[PDB]
Structure 1
Amino acid sequence: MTEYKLVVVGAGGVGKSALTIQLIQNHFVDEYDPSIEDSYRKQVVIDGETCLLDILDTAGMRTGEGFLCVFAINNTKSFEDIHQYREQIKRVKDSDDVPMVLVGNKCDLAARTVESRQAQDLARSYGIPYIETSAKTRQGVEDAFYTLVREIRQH
C-alpha cells in the first residue's frame, strides 16, 4: 500500500468538504457542520497500485505532497483567490513545481460566472491540469483526486 498525502485548499464555500465527502462516502450533503472532520483516509487501487490516500480538507501543507486547489464556477471571487493559494503553496514548498490540480467545482449549476476557458488559461500558466467537478452529481470527482495522484507520480 502506497500512501499519498493530498491537501484540499480554496475559498470558503467552494465545496472542498463536499468533494472530499463525495470521494469518501459517494454521498452529497447540502450542508456541512462547521465542526466536520478535516482528516480522511481512503484505500483505492489507482492504475493497478493499492493506495492509501491521506486527505486534509482545509478551512476556507508543509506535509502535503499534492494540492487540490478548488474554486466554484459560480463564485468569481473564489477563482480570483486561486492566485493567493498558489502563492502560498509556492512559498511553503519554495518551488513553482508542485503537484497541483486546479478544480472548478459546482459544475451542475446553471449560469456559471467563471468560464472553462478562463480556468484552463490559469492552469496553463501554472503548468497544471484543470478539471471541472460536481460534488453533487459526482462528475469529475474521481478524475480530480486521481489526477492529483498521477501528478505526484510524475514528480
Structure 2
Amino acid sequence: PQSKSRKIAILGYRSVGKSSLTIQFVEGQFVDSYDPTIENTFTKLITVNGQEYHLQLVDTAGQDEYSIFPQTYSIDINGYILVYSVTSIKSFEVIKVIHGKLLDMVGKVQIPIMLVGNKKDLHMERVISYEEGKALAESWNAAFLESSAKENQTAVDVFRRIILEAEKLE
C-alpha cells in the first residue's frame, strides 16, 4: 500500500523536550521558547525501508507521578515514545510510572514502546548514564535511544525507530 497511516504519542514528564524533539523532526528547527503544552498534533510524512508512512504525532502535555493517564492515549495509538531528560533524575523516575500506568490502561495488546533519553548534548548536566536508561528499556523489552532536540538526525532516528519497532509487531 503506497502509504500507511500510524498514530504516535510522545509522552513524558515536563520540560524533557517532547515538543522540541517533535518540532525538530516535523519542522526541522529548534525552538527555545518554552511553552507548556496542552496538546499539539502534526501530520508528518516519512518513509521507512521503502514504505512511506503518514504519521499522526500527538505531542502530549507533561504529566508526573500523580496524574491520570489520559484514556484517549489508551486507544488507537500505534506507537509510544516515552522520553526522559538525561539531565533530570525526576524525569527518569516519572517515566517509570507513566510506563506502568500506560501498560495497565492498554491492557494486553502488542503496542510498540520505545524509551528515549533526551538532551544528550548538555554534557555538563547529564545525571543519568546511557547504560542506566538502556537497562530500563531492556527491562521493558523496549527500544532505547538517546537524543537531542537540537540534533535533527537523532530526532529523525527516533521517529524512524518506533515505526521500525511497530511494523515488527504487525
Shorter chain as normaliser: what TM range? over 0.9
TM-score (norm 2): 0.86
Deviation at 1:96, TM superposition (A): 7.3
Q: What is the TM-score when the length of structure 1 is the normalising length?
A: 0.94
Q: 1:36 to 1:81 in 2, by over 3 A?
A: closer
Q: Which runs of 5+ in 1 are unaligned?
A: none
Equivalent position to 1:115, from 117, 125, 129:
129
- Report the 3-state secondary structure (helix = DSSP H, G, I; strand = E; otherwise coil) of the residue aligned with 2:161: helix
Distance (whole Å) between structure 2 residues aligned to residue 115 and residue 138 of structure 1: 21
Q: Deviations over 1:46-97 (max 9, x none)?
A: 1101110000000001221110000001011001111111112112211374
Q: In the alignment, does 2:93 pair up with 1:77?
A: no
Displacement of 1:143 after TM fit? 1.2
Going from structure 1 to structure 2, the CA distance change for 1:108 and 1:50 (only over 3 Å counts) comes to same
1:124 match: secondary structure: helix
In structure 2, relative to structure 1, the CA distance for the partners of 1:6 and 1:35 (3 Å cut) is closer
In structure 1, C-alpha distance between the alignment counterparts of 2:37 and 2:119, rounded to whole Å? 22
The one of 154, 159, 166 equivalent to 1:140 is 154
SS in 2 for 1:3: strand
C-alpha change, 1:85 and 1:35, in structure 2 (3 Å) is: closer
Name the CA distance, whole Å, in 2 between partners of 1:31 and 1:76.
23
Which of 51, 55, 58 is the equivalent residue of 1:56? 58
1:104 alignment counterpart: 117
Q: 1:81 aligns to what SS in structure 2?
A: helix
How large is the Cα RMSD of the aligned pairs? 1.5
| Structure 1 residue ranges, 4+ long, deviating more than 6 angstroms after superposition | none
CA distance in 2, matches of 1:48, 1:35: 33
**Counterpart position of 2:101:** 88
Give the number of aligned pairs: 155
Q: Structure 1 residues 153, 101: closer, same or farther in 2, change over 3 A?
A: same
3-state SS, counterpart of residue 21 of structure 1 = helix
Give identity over the alignment, percent. Answer: 34
Out of 138-147 and 100-109, give the one that drifted further.
138-147
Shift of 1:122: 0.2
